[PDB]
Enzyme design. Structure first.
Site, PDB file in Angstrom:
ATOM      1  CG  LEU A  23       3.482   3.961  -1.803  1.00 40.14           C
ATOM      2  CD1 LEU A  23       3.044   4.023  -3.278  1.00 40.14           C
ATOM      3  CD2 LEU A  23       3.968   2.558  -1.491  1.00 40.14           C
ATOM      4  CD  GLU A  30       6.749   0.432  -8.766  1.00 40.46           C
ATOM      5  OE1 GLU A  30       5.802   0.934  -8.103  1.00 40.46           O
ATOM      6  OE2 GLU A  30       6.944  -0.806  -8.929  1.00 40.46           O
TER       7      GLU A  30
HETATM    8  N1  LIG Z   1       6.588   0.030  -1.500  1.00 39.00           N
HETATM    9  C1  LIG Z   1       5.555  -0.835  -1.560  1.00 39.00           C
HETATM   10  O1  LIG Z   1       5.469  -1.697  -2.618  1.00 39.00           O
HETATM   11  C2  LIG Z   1       4.453  -0.940  -0.532  1.00 39.00           C
HETATM   12  C3  LIG Z   1       4.614  -0.331   0.713  1.00 39.00           C
HETATM   13  N2  LIG Z   1       3.602  -0.320   1.619  1.00 39.00           N
HETATM   14  C4  LIG Z   1       3.849   0.401   2.888  1.00 39.00           C
HETATM   15  O2  LIG Z   1       3.774  -0.411   4.031  1.00 39.00           O
HETATM   16  C5  LIG Z   1       3.341   0.348   5.146  1.00 39.00           C
HETATM   17  C6  LIG Z   1       2.163  -0.424   5.714  1.00 39.00           C
HETATM   18  O3  LIG Z   1       2.652  -1.626   6.299  1.00 39.00           O
HETATM   19  P1  LIG Z   1       2.256  -2.058   7.789  1.00 39.00           P
HETATM   20  O4  LIG Z   1       2.119  -0.896   8.649  1.00 39.00           O
HETATM   21  O5  LIG Z   1       3.075  -3.193   8.296  1.00 39.00           O
HETATM   22  O6  LIG Z   1       0.760  -2.579   7.629  1.00 39.00           O
HETATM   23  P2  LIG Z   1       0.034  -3.640   6.659  1.00 39.00           P
HETATM   24  O7  LIG Z   1      -0.517  -3.077   5.407  1.00 39.00           O
HETATM   25  O8  LIG Z   1       0.810  -4.871   6.532  1.00 39.00           O
HETATM   26  O9  LIG Z   1      -1.205  -3.934   7.635  1.00 39.00           O
HETATM   27  C7  LIG Z   1      -1.008  -4.512   8.917  1.00 39.00           C
HETATM   28  C8  LIG Z   1      -2.399  -4.862   9.444  1.00 39.00           C
HETATM   29  O10 LIG Z   1      -2.884  -5.966   8.694  1.00 39.00           O
HETATM   30  C9  LIG Z   1      -3.576  -6.887   9.515  1.00 39.00           C
HETATM   31  N3  LIG Z   1      -2.874  -8.203   9.529  1.00 39.00           N
HETATM   32  C10 LIG Z   1      -1.534  -8.468   9.547  1.00 39.00           C
HETATM   33  N4  LIG Z   1      -1.358  -9.821   9.557  1.00 39.00           N
HETATM   34  C11 LIG Z   1      -2.579 -10.394   9.572  1.00 39.00           C
HETATM   35  C12 LIG Z   1      -3.020 -11.720   9.551  1.00 39.00           C
HETATM   36  N5  LIG Z   1      -2.194 -12.752   9.558  1.00 39.00           N
HETATM   37  N6  LIG Z   1      -4.354 -11.960   9.556  1.00 39.00           N
HETATM   38  C13 LIG Z   1      -5.289 -10.963   9.552  1.00 39.00           C
HETATM   39  N7  LIG Z   1      -4.854  -9.648   9.563  1.00 39.00           N
HETATM   40  C14 LIG Z   1      -3.528  -9.379   9.565  1.00 39.00           C
HETATM   41  C15 LIG Z   1      -3.638  -6.269  10.897  1.00 39.00           C
HETATM   42  O11 LIG Z   1      -4.802  -5.490  10.870  1.00 39.00           O
HETATM   43  P3  LIG Z   1      -5.570  -5.014  12.223  1.00 39.00           P
HETATM   44  O12 LIG Z   1      -4.712  -4.032  13.003  1.00 39.00           O
HETATM   45  O13 LIG Z   1      -6.894  -4.396  11.771  1.00 39.00           O
HETATM   46  O14 LIG Z   1      -6.073  -6.241  12.942  1.00 39.00           O
HETATM   47  C16 LIG Z   1      -2.400  -5.376  10.898  1.00 39.00           C
HETATM   48  O15 LIG Z   1      -2.404  -4.294  11.835  1.00 39.00           O
HETATM   49  C17 LIG Z   1       2.997   1.753   4.651  1.00 39.00           C
HETATM   50  O16 LIG Z   1       4.131   2.599   4.808  1.00 39.00           O
HETATM   51  C18 LIG Z   1       2.840   1.528   3.169  1.00 39.00           C
HETATM   52  O17 LIG Z   1       3.099   2.689   2.433  1.00 39.00           O
HETATM   53  C19 LIG Z   1       2.381  -0.976   1.346  1.00 39.00           C
HETATM   54  C20 LIG Z   1       2.171  -1.643   0.109  1.00 39.00           C
HETATM   55  C21 LIG Z   1       3.224  -1.615  -0.849  1.00 39.00           C
HETATM   56  C1  LIG Z   2       0.793   3.301   0.848  1.00 40.94           C
HETATM   57  O1  LIG Z   2      -0.236   3.978  -0.078  1.00 40.94           O
HETATM   58  C2  LIG Z   2      -0.578   3.282  -1.246  1.00 40.94           C
HETATM   59  C3  LIG Z   2      -1.266   3.887  -2.298  1.00 40.94           C
HETATM   60  C4  LIG Z   2      -1.624   3.167  -3.458  1.00 40.94           C
HETATM   61  C5  LIG Z   2      -2.295   3.802  -4.490  1.00 40.94           C
HETATM   62  C6  LIG Z   2      -2.092   5.169  -4.733  1.00 40.94           C
HETATM   63  C7  LIG Z   2      -2.785   5.791  -5.779  1.00 40.94           C
HETATM   64  C8  LIG Z   2      -3.651   5.016  -6.573  1.00 40.94           C
HETATM   65  C9  LIG Z   2      -3.847   3.642  -6.323  1.00 40.94           C
HETATM   66  C10 LIG Z   2      -3.156   3.043  -5.281  1.00 40.94           C
HETATM   67  C11 LIG Z   2      -1.302   1.803  -3.596  1.00 40.94           C
HETATM   68  C12 LIG Z   2      -0.627   1.213  -2.533  1.00 40.94           C
HETATM   69  C13 LIG Z   2      -0.267  -0.238  -2.523  1.00 40.94           C
HETATM   70  C14 LIG Z   2      -1.567  -1.054  -2.619  1.00 40.94           C
HETATM   71  C15 LIG Z   2       0.816  -0.552  -3.488  1.00 40.94           C
HETATM   72  C16 LIG Z   2       1.707  -0.866  -4.184  1.00 40.94           C
HETATM   73  C17 LIG Z   2       2.760  -1.350  -4.984  1.00 40.94           C
HETATM   74  C18 LIG Z   2       3.403  -0.499  -5.904  1.00 40.94           C
HETATM   75  C19 LIG Z   2       3.020   0.989  -6.112  1.00 40.94           C
HETATM   76  N1  LIG Z   2       4.397  -1.012  -6.641  1.00 40.94           N
HETATM   77  C20 LIG Z   2       4.800  -2.280  -6.502  1.00 40.94           C
HETATM   78  N2  LIG Z   2       5.774  -2.766  -7.277  1.00 40.94           N
HETATM   79  N3  LIG Z   2       4.199  -3.087  -5.660  1.00 40.94           N
HETATM   80  C21 LIG Z   2       3.193  -2.701  -4.869  1.00 40.94           C
HETATM   81  N4  LIG Z   2       2.667  -3.613  -4.017  1.00 40.94           N
HETATM   82  C22 LIG Z   2      -0.285   1.919  -1.379  1.00 40.94           C
END
Ligand SMILES: NC(=O)C1=CN([C@@H]2O[C@H](COP(=O)(O)OP(=O)(O)OC[C@H]3O[C@@H](n4cnc5c(N)ncnc54)[C@H](OP(=O)(O)O)[C@@H]3O)[C@@H](O)[C@H]2O)C=CC1
Ligand SMILES: COc1cc(-c2ccccc2)cc([C@@H](C)C#Cc2c(C)nc(N)nc2N)c1
Length: 225
Positions: A23, A30
């Site tokens: 993140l 948040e």
């Molecule tokens: N601001 C926010 O609310 C959030 C932000 N993030 C951010 O997003 C980033 C991560 O995203 P990203 O790199 O795209 O990766 P993802 O978390 O989306 O993971 C991608 C992996 O998921 C698997 N996958 C994707 N599609 C499928 C499918 N249809 N079926 C089965 N497996 C699938 C694959 O795994 P494999 O390679 O093993 O096959 C792929 O490499 C990080 O920077 C993180 O911090 C994450 C959550 C929340």
């Molecule tokens: C990329 O690294 C991550 C760390 C955490 C995490 C960090 C500390 C404790 C528990 C979870 C959660 C996440 C994911 C699962 C998330 C999220 C998320 C947040 C923080 N806010 C909104 N609104 N939506 C989400 N999906 C990612």
């Protein structure tokens, strides 16, 4: 017939969500919103599901996974099939789509899932625009003094605003009824966009809890026997 809800914290105007696997901000308030929303249910006998891609799973600190009091599903193409218990609180799926169909069977689920939250990351969210019924988006804006953080992963805003409209007038009612929100609802112009939802400030940022809902659809075909 359990709602599928994408939930995400995104920086305006590009809807950036991530940088180098992590993140781009650490905002305790948040995180508290995300925690409460995905944990809490209206019905005490239900849990919610949180579904995430493998890379998102790997970014959660090891002490904090699996996320407590929620059914966790991790999706990886290298996993075995469509929904498999691998540990307490942990399911593996090799298919985002088939795991959602599996989670929706009342026979498997005993009607004890309230909602299914899709919690990221980028690749997962790309694939969820046509799967989600709603999006809970925290819209994050750096205050005038704040350096914009670098980012490498983005929510697809175009495809969002194609399929969904800003339904933030109903956000309070949409959330489980025990959550308490600090702000009141609030329409603010920011860099030429309308930002509506529930305000907070923390660290260098202002942010709004918003809700997006599927736009109305014409009736082109219903399938008959
Ligand atoms: N601001 C926010 O609310 C959030 C932000 N993030 C951010 O997003 C980033 C991560 O995203 P990203 O790199 O795209 O990766 P993802 O978390 O989306 O993971 C991608 C992996 O998921 C698997 N996958 C994707 N599609 C499928 C499918 N249809 N079926 C089965 N497996 C699938 C694959 O795994 P494999 O390679 O093993 O096959 C792929 O490499 C990080 O920077 C993180 O911090 C994450 C959550 C929340
Ligand atoms: C990329 O690294 C991550 C760390 C955490 C995490 C960090 C500390 C404790 C528990 C979870 C959660 C996440 C994911 C699962 C998330 C999220 C998320 C947040 C923080 N806010 C909104 N609104 N939506 C989400 N999906 C990612």
């Amino acid at each position: 017939k359990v709602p599928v809800v994408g939930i995400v914290a995104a920086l305006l105007p590009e809807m950036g969500i991530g940088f180098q696997g992590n993140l781009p901000w650490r905002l305790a308030k948040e995180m508290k919103y995300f925690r409460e929303v995905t944990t809490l249910t209206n019905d005490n006998s239900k849990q919610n599901v949180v579904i995430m891609g493998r890379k998102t799973w790997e970014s959660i600190p090891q002490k904090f996974r699996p996320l407590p009091k929620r059914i966790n599903v991790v999706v990886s193409r290298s996993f075995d099939g469509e929904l498999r218990k691998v540990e307490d609180g942990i399911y593996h799926s090799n298919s985002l789509r088939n795991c959602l169909t599996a989670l929706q069977s009342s026979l498997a689920n005993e009607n004890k899932i309230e909602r299914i939250y899709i919690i990221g990351g980028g690749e997962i969210y790309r694939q969820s625009m046509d799967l989600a019924d709603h999006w809970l988006i925290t819209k994050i804006m750096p205050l005038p003094e704040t350096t914009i953080p670098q980012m490498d992963t983005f929510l697809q805003k175009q495809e969002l605003e194609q399929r969904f409209y800003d339904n933030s007038d109903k956000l309070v009612d949409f959330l489980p009824s025990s959550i308490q929100l600090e702000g009141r609802l609030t329409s603010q112009e920011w860099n030429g966009e309308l930002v509506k939802g529930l305000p907070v400030q923390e660290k260098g940022y202002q942010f709004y809890f918003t809700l997006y809902t599927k736009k109305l659809e014409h009736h082109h075909h219903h399938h008959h026997h």
